[PDB]
Amino acid sequence: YTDKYDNINLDEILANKRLLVAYVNCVMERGKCSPEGKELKEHLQDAIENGCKKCTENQEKGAYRVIEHLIKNEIEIWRELTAKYDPTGNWRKKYEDRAKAAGIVIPE
């Protein structure tokens, strides 16, 4: 399935810092996107900008895996992503509330 491909690529991105940086740069429009990077970026952007209006259930889950990872481990990147895609902050708040409910402490 294309879902399986997304899942293993997300597994790779979250495990390898080089891939995560390349992916984040692709999402932030400051680096090249591979075809899979472009596909995952579409859903991560949809998640932050629009609450994943067009994401399938598996795509939304995949986007949140990266969101929670960034909130917990790369807060500065999470802040850049939300300033770019959700400055209004309603979706940002929904995800931050979910991460806090998972016990993640978020600095101001």
Short mmCIF file of N, CA, C and O in Angstrom, two decimals:
data_model
loop_
_atom_site.label_atom_id
_atom_site.label_comp_id
_atom_site.label_asym_id
_atom_site.label_seq_id
_atom_site.Cartn_x
_atom_site.Cartn_y
_atom_site.Cartn_z
N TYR A 1 0.87 -1.21 0.00
CA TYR A 1 0.00 0.00 0.00
C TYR A 1 0.89 1.24 0.00
O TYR A 1 2.09 1.18 0.32
N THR A 2 0.32 2.36 -0.40
CA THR A 2 1.05 3.62 -0.38
C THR A 2 1.16 4.03 1.10
O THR A 2 2.05 4.78 1.48
N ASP A 3 0.23 3.53 1.91
CA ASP A 3 0.26 3.80 3.35
C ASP A 3 1.49 3.13 3.94
O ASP A 3 2.16 3.69 4.79
N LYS A 4 1.77 1.90 3.51
CA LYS A 4 2.93 1.20 4.04
C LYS A 4 4.20 1.95 3.69
O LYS A 4 5.08 2.07 4.53
N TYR A 5 4.29 2.44 2.45
CA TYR A 5 5.47 3.21 2.02
C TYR A 5 5.63 4.47 2.88
O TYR A 5 6.73 4.80 3.31
N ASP A 6 4.54 5.20 3.09
CA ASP A 6 4.62 6.39 3.93
C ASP A 6 5.09 5.99 5.33
O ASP A 6 5.94 6.65 5.93
N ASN A 7 4.54 4.90 5.87
CA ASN A 7 4.91 4.55 7.23
C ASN A 7 6.36 4.21 7.38
O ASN A 7 6.99 4.64 8.35
N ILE A 8 6.93 3.47 6.42
CA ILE A 8 8.33 3.13 6.57
C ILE A 8 9.22 4.33 6.31
O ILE A 8 10.27 4.47 6.95
N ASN A 9 8.79 5.23 5.42
CA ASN A 9 9.59 6.45 5.19
C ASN A 9 9.57 7.36 6.43
O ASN A 9 10.57 7.99 6.76
N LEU A 10 8.42 7.43 7.10
CA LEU A 10 8.33 8.22 8.32
C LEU A 10 9.19 7.56 9.39
O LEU A 10 9.88 8.24 10.15
N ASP A 11 9.18 6.23 9.43
CA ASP A 11 10.03 5.55 10.42
C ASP A 11 11.48 6.00 10.21
O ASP A 11 12.20 6.30 11.18
N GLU A 12 11.90 6.05 8.95
CA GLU A 12 13.28 6.40 8.59
C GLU A 12 13.61 7.84 8.94
O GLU A 12 14.68 8.14 9.47
N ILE A 13 12.69 8.73 8.62
CA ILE A 13 12.86 10.15 8.92
C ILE A 13 13.01 10.38 10.42
O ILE A 13 13.88 11.13 10.83
N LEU A 14 12.20 9.70 11.23
CA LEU A 14 12.24 9.92 12.67
C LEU A 14 13.42 9.27 13.34
O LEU A 14 13.75 9.62 14.49
N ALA A 15 14.08 8.36 12.64
CA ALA A 15 15.22 7.66 13.25
C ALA A 15 16.58 8.22 12.86
O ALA A 15 17.57 8.07 13.60
N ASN A 16 16.62 8.83 11.69
CA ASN A 16 17.85 9.38 11.12
C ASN A 16 17.80 10.91 11.06
O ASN A 16 17.05 11.48 10.28
N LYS A 17 18.59 11.56 11.91
CA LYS A 17 18.65 13.02 11.96
C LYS A 17 18.90 13.70 10.62
O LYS A 17 18.37 14.78 10.34
N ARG A 18 19.71 13.07 9.77
CA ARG A 18 20.00 13.66 8.47
C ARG A 18 18.71 13.70 7.64
O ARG A 18 18.46 14.66 6.90
N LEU A 19 17.91 12.64 7.75
CA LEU A 19 16.68 12.60 6.97
C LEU A 19 15.65 13.56 7.53
O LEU A 19 14.90 14.17 6.77
N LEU A 20 15.60 13.68 8.84
CA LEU A 20 14.68 14.61 9.46
C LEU A 20 15.03 16.04 9.04
O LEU A 20 14.15 16.81 8.70
N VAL A 21 16.32 16.42 9.07
CA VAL A 21 16.68 17.78 8.67
C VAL A 21 16.31 18.03 7.21
O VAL A 21 15.73 19.07 6.88
N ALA A 22 16.60 17.07 6.34
CA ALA A 22 16.29 17.21 4.91
C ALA A 22 14.76 17.31 4.74
O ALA A 22 14.26 18.11 3.95
N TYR A 23 14.02 16.53 5.52
CA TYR A 23 12.56 16.59 5.40
C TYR A 23 12.00 17.95 5.87
O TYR A 23 11.16 18.56 5.21
N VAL A 24 12.46 18.41 7.02
CA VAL A 24 12.03 19.69 7.57
C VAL A 24 12.36 20.81 6.57
O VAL A 24 11.56 21.71 6.32
N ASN A 25 13.55 20.75 5.98
CA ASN A 25 13.91 21.78 5.01
C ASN A 25 12.97 21.75 3.82
O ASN A 25 12.56 22.79 3.30
N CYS A 26 12.57 20.54 3.41
CA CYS A 26 11.65 20.41 2.31
C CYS A 26 10.31 21.04 2.73
O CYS A 26 9.75 21.87 2.00
N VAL A 27 9.80 20.67 3.90
CA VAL A 27 8.54 21.25 4.36
C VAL A 27 8.60 22.77 4.51
O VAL A 27 7.62 23.46 4.20
N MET A 28 9.73 23.31 4.97
CA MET A 28 9.91 24.75 5.16
C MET A 28 10.25 25.51 3.85
O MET A 28 10.41 26.73 3.86
N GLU A 29 10.33 24.77 2.75
CA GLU A 29 10.62 25.35 1.43
C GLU A 29 11.97 26.02 1.40
O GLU A 29 12.12 27.15 0.90
N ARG A 30 12.95 25.33 1.97
CA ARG A 30 14.33 25.80 1.99
C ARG A 30 15.27 24.63 1.67
O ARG A 30 16.46 24.64 2.02
N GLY A 31 14.74 23.63 0.98
CA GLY A 31 15.54 22.48 0.59
C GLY A 31 14.75 21.66 -0.41
O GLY A 31 13.54 21.85 -0.55
N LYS A 32 15.42 20.74 -1.10
CA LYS A 32 14.75 19.92 -2.08
C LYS A 32 13.88 18.86 -1.46
O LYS A 32 14.14 18.36 -0.36
N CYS A 33 12.83 18.53 -2.19
CA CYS A 33 11.91 17.48 -1.76
C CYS A 33 11.99 16.31 -2.71
O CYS A 33 11.93 16.48 -3.94
N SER A 34 12.12 15.11 -2.16
CA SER A 34 12.10 13.92 -2.99
C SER A 34 10.60 13.74 -3.27
O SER A 34 9.77 14.46 -2.72
N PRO A 35 10.23 12.79 -4.13
CA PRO A 35 8.80 12.61 -4.38
C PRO A 35 8.05 12.19 -3.09
O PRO A 35 6.92 12.63 -2.85
N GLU A 36 8.68 11.34 -2.28
CA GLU A 36 8.01 10.91 -1.04
C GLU A 36 7.98 12.07 -0.06
O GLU A 36 7.00 12.26 0.67
N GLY A 37 9.05 12.86 -0.04
CA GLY A 37 9.09 14.02 0.83
C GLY A 37 7.95 14.97 0.46
O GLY A 37 7.27 15.53 1.35
N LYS A 38 7.74 15.16 -0.84
CA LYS A 38 6.67 16.06 -1.29
C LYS A 38 5.31 15.55 -0.85
O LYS A 38 4.47 16.34 -0.43
N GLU A 39 5.10 14.24 -0.94
CA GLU A 39 3.84 13.63 -0.52
C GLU A 39 3.61 13.79 1.00
O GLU A 39 2.54 14.19 1.44
N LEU A 40 4.62 13.46 1.81
CA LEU A 40 4.45 13.63 3.25
C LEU A 40 4.29 15.12 3.61
O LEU A 40 3.53 15.48 4.50
N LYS A 41 5.00 15.99 2.91
CA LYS A 41 4.90 17.42 3.17
C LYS A 41 3.46 17.90 2.92
O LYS A 41 2.95 18.71 3.67
N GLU A 42 2.84 17.41 1.86
CA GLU A 42 1.46 17.81 1.55
C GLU A 42 0.55 17.55 2.75
O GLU A 42 -0.31 18.39 3.08
N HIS A 43 0.73 16.40 3.40
CA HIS A 43 -0.14 16.07 4.52
C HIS A 43 0.26 16.77 5.80
O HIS A 43 -0.62 17.11 6.59
N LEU A 44 1.55 17.02 6.00
CA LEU A 44 1.97 17.73 7.21
C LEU A 44 1.51 19.19 7.12
O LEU A 44 1.05 19.78 8.09
N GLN A 45 1.61 19.75 5.93
CA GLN A 45 1.17 21.12 5.72
C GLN A 45 -0.34 21.16 5.90
O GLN A 45 -0.87 22.09 6.51
N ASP A 46 -1.04 20.15 5.40
CA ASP A 46 -2.50 20.15 5.53
C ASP A 46 -2.86 20.06 7.03
O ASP A 46 -3.76 20.74 7.52
N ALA A 47 -2.10 19.26 7.77
CA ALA A 47 -2.37 19.13 9.18
C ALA A 47 -2.22 20.46 9.92
O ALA A 47 -3.07 20.83 10.73
N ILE A 48 -1.13 21.18 9.65
CA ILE A 48 -0.87 22.42 10.39
C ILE A 48 -1.70 23.60 9.90
O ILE A 48 -2.20 24.43 10.69
N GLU A 49 -1.89 23.66 8.60
CA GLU A 49 -2.64 24.76 7.99
C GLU A 49 -4.15 24.63 8.07
O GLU A 49 -4.86 25.62 8.31
N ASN A 50 -4.62 23.41 7.86
CA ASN A 50 -6.06 23.16 7.71
C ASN A 50 -6.65 22.06 8.58
O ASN A 50 -7.81 21.68 8.37
N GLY A 51 -5.90 21.56 9.56
CA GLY A 51 -6.44 20.48 10.38
C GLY A 51 -6.57 19.15 9.63
O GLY A 51 -7.38 18.29 10.01
N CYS A 52 -5.76 18.97 8.58
CA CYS A 52 -5.71 17.73 7.77
C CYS A 52 -7.05 17.42 7.09
O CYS A 52 -7.49 16.26 7.01
N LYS A 53 -7.63 18.49 6.56
CA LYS A 53 -8.92 18.43 5.85
C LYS A 53 -8.95 17.33 4.80
O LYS A 53 -9.96 16.61 4.67
N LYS A 54 -7.88 17.19 4.03
CA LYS A 54 -7.87 16.17 3.00
C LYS A 54 -7.04 14.91 3.30
O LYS A 54 -6.85 14.06 2.44
N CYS A 55 -6.59 14.78 4.53
CA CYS A 55 -5.78 13.60 4.89
C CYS A 55 -6.63 12.39 5.15
O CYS A 55 -7.71 12.50 5.71
N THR A 56 -6.14 11.23 4.77
CA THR A 56 -6.84 10.00 5.10
C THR A 56 -6.49 9.77 6.58
O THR A 56 -5.66 10.48 7.16
N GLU A 57 -7.09 8.77 7.21
CA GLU A 57 -6.77 8.48 8.61
C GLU A 57 -5.27 8.16 8.77
O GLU A 57 -4.62 8.69 9.68
N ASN A 58 -4.73 7.32 7.89
CA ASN A 58 -3.30 6.97 8.02
C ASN A 58 -2.39 8.16 7.78
O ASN A 58 -1.34 8.29 8.41
N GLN A 59 -2.80 9.05 6.87
CA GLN A 59 -1.98 10.22 6.58
C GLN A 59 -1.97 11.19 7.76
O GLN A 59 -0.94 11.81 8.07
N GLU A 60 -3.12 11.32 8.44
CA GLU A 60 -3.18 12.22 9.57
C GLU A 60 -2.33 11.66 10.71
O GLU A 60 -1.60 12.40 11.38
N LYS A 61 -2.40 10.35 10.90
CA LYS A 61 -1.60 9.71 11.96
C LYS A 61 -0.12 9.94 11.69
O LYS A 61 0.64 10.24 12.61
N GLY A 62 0.29 9.80 10.43
CA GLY A 62 1.68 9.99 10.05
C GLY A 62 2.14 11.41 10.29
O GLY A 62 3.24 11.66 10.78
N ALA A 63 1.28 12.37 9.97
CA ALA A 63 1.62 13.76 10.19
C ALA A 63 1.77 13.99 11.69
O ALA A 63 2.72 14.64 12.14
N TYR A 64 0.87 13.44 12.50
CA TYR A 64 1.00 13.69 13.94
C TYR A 64 2.25 13.04 14.53
O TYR A 64 2.80 13.55 15.49
N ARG A 65 2.71 11.93 13.95
CA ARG A 65 3.94 11.32 14.47
C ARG A 65 5.07 12.35 14.37
O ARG A 65 5.89 12.48 15.27
N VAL A 66 5.11 13.08 13.27
CA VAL A 66 6.17 14.06 13.12
C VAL A 66 5.90 15.27 14.02
O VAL A 66 6.81 15.76 14.68
N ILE A 67 4.65 15.72 14.06
CA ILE A 67 4.31 16.85 14.93
C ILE A 67 4.73 16.61 16.39
O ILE A 67 5.40 17.44 16.98
N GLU A 68 4.35 15.46 16.95
CA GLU A 68 4.68 15.21 18.36
C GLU A 68 6.19 15.11 18.55
O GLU A 68 6.71 15.57 19.58
N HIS A 69 6.86 14.49 17.58
CA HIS A 69 8.32 14.35 17.63
C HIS A 69 8.95 15.74 17.66
O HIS A 69 9.90 15.97 18.41
N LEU A 70 8.45 16.67 16.83
CA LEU A 70 9.02 18.02 16.81
C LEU A 70 8.71 18.80 18.09
O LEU A 70 9.56 19.53 18.60
N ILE A 71 7.48 18.66 18.61
CA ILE A 71 7.15 19.38 19.82
C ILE A 71 8.00 18.88 20.97
O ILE A 71 8.45 19.67 21.82
N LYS A 72 8.28 17.59 20.99
CA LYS A 72 9.06 17.06 22.08
C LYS A 72 10.54 17.29 21.94
O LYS A 72 11.22 17.65 22.93
N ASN A 73 11.04 17.14 20.72
CA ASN A 73 12.48 17.20 20.48
C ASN A 73 13.11 18.34 19.71
O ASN A 73 14.32 18.54 19.80
N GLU A 74 12.30 19.05 18.93
CA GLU A 74 12.81 20.13 18.07
C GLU A 74 11.81 21.30 18.13
O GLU A 74 11.25 21.72 17.10
N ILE A 75 11.58 21.81 19.34
CA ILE A 75 10.61 22.87 19.52
C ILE A 75 10.83 24.09 18.64
O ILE A 75 9.88 24.71 18.18
N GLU A 76 12.09 24.44 18.38
CA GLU A 76 12.36 25.58 17.52
C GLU A 76 11.80 25.35 16.10
O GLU A 76 11.23 26.26 15.50
N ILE A 77 11.94 24.13 15.59
CA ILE A 77 11.41 23.81 14.28
C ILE A 77 9.88 23.85 14.33
O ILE A 77 9.23 24.37 13.42
N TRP A 78 9.29 23.30 15.40
CA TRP A 78 7.83 23.34 15.52
C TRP A 78 7.37 24.79 15.48
O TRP A 78 6.40 25.14 14.78
N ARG A 79 8.09 25.66 16.18
CA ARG A 79 7.74 27.06 16.18
C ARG A 79 7.86 27.68 14.78
O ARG A 79 7.04 28.48 14.39
N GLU A 80 8.88 27.30 14.03
CA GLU A 80 9.01 27.84 12.68
C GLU A 80 7.89 27.35 11.78
O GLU A 80 7.37 28.11 10.94
N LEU A 81 7.55 26.06 11.91
CA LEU A 81 6.51 25.49 11.09
C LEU A 81 5.16 26.15 11.34
O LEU A 81 4.40 26.40 10.41
N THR A 82 4.84 26.40 12.60
CA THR A 82 3.54 27.00 12.91
C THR A 82 3.52 28.48 12.54
O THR A 82 2.48 29.00 12.17
N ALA A 83 4.67 29.15 12.63
CA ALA A 83 4.68 30.57 12.24
C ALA A 83 4.45 30.67 10.74
O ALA A 83 3.80 31.61 10.26
N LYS A 84 4.94 29.69 10.00
CA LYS A 84 4.78 29.72 8.56
C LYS A 84 3.40 29.27 8.08
O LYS A 84 2.78 29.94 7.25
N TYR A 85 2.90 28.16 8.65
CA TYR A 85 1.65 27.56 8.22
C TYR A 85 0.39 27.79 9.06
O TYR A 85 -0.73 27.61 8.55
N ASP A 86 0.55 28.16 10.33
CA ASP A 86 -0.61 28.42 11.19
C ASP A 86 -0.40 29.55 12.20
O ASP A 86 -0.55 29.37 13.41
N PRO A 87 -0.06 30.74 11.71
CA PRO A 87 0.15 31.85 12.64
C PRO A 87 -1.09 32.22 13.46
O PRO A 87 -0.97 32.82 14.52
N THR A 88 -2.28 31.87 12.97
CA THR A 88 -3.53 32.13 13.70
C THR A 88 -3.50 31.26 14.97
O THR A 88 -4.02 31.65 16.02
N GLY A 89 -2.92 30.06 14.83
CA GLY A 89 -2.71 29.16 15.95
C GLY A 89 -3.77 28.21 16.47
O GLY A 89 -3.55 27.57 17.48
N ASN A 90 -4.92 28.10 15.81
CA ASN A 90 -5.94 27.19 16.33
C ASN A 90 -5.54 25.72 16.16
O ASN A 90 -5.81 24.89 17.05
N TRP A 91 -4.89 25.39 15.04
CA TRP A 91 -4.48 24.00 14.85
C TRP A 91 -3.25 23.76 15.71
O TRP A 91 -3.11 22.70 16.32
N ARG A 92 -2.35 24.75 15.76
CA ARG A 92 -1.17 24.62 16.61
C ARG A 92 -1.62 24.27 18.02
O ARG A 92 -1.06 23.36 18.66
N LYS A 93 -2.63 24.99 18.53
CA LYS A 93 -3.12 24.73 19.87
C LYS A 93 -3.68 23.32 20.02
O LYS A 93 -3.45 22.68 21.04
N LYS A 94 -4.45 22.87 19.04
CA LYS A 94 -4.99 21.51 19.12
C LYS A 94 -3.87 20.48 19.28
O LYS A 94 -3.97 19.57 20.12
N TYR A 95 -2.78 20.63 18.52
CA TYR A 95 -1.68 19.66 18.60
C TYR A 95 -0.88 19.83 19.87
O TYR A 95 -0.43 18.83 20.45
N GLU A 96 -0.69 21.08 20.30
CA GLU A 96 0.06 21.26 21.55
C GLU A 96 -0.75 20.69 22.71
O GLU A 96 -0.17 20.08 23.61
N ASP A 97 -2.07 20.88 22.71
CA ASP A 97 -2.87 20.31 23.80
C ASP A 97 -2.76 18.79 23.79
O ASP A 97 -2.71 18.15 24.86
N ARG A 98 -2.71 18.20 22.60
CA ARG A 98 -2.60 16.74 22.56
C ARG A 98 -1.25 16.28 23.10
O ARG A 98 -1.16 15.30 23.86
N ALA A 99 -0.18 16.99 22.72
CA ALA A 99 1.14 16.62 23.22
C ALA A 99 1.23 16.78 24.74
O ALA A 99 1.83 15.95 25.41
N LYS A 100 0.64 17.85 25.27
CA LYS A 100 0.66 18.07 26.72
C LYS A 100 -0.11 16.94 27.41
O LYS A 100 0.29 16.47 28.48
N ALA A 101 -1.20 16.49 26.79
CA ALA A 101 -2.00 15.40 27.37
C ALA A 101 -1.20 14.10 27.37
O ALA A 101 -1.56 13.15 28.08
N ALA A 102 -0.13 14.05 26.57
CA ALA A 102 0.72 12.87 26.50
C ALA A 102 1.91 13.05 27.44
O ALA A 102 2.88 12.27 27.39
N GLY A 103 1.86 14.09 28.27
CA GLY A 103 2.91 14.38 29.24
C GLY A 103 4.14 15.16 28.76
O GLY A 103 5.15 15.26 29.48
N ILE A 104 4.07 15.69 27.55
CA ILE A 104 5.19 16.45 27.03
C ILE A 104 5.14 17.86 27.59
O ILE A 104 4.11 18.50 27.56
N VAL A 105 6.25 18.32 28.16
CA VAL A 105 6.33 19.67 28.72
C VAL A 105 6.79 20.59 27.60
O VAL A 105 7.79 20.32 26.94
N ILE A 106 6.05 21.68 27.39
CA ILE A 106 6.37 22.63 26.33
C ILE A 106 6.78 24.01 26.87
O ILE A 106 5.99 24.68 27.51
N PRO A 107 8.03 24.43 26.60
CA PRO A 107 8.56 25.73 27.04
C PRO A 107 7.89 26.86 26.27
O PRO A 107 7.45 26.67 25.14
N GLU A 108 7.84 28.05 26.88
CA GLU A 108 7.23 29.21 26.23
C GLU A 108 8.28 30.08 25.54
O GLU A 108 8.12 30.37 24.34
#
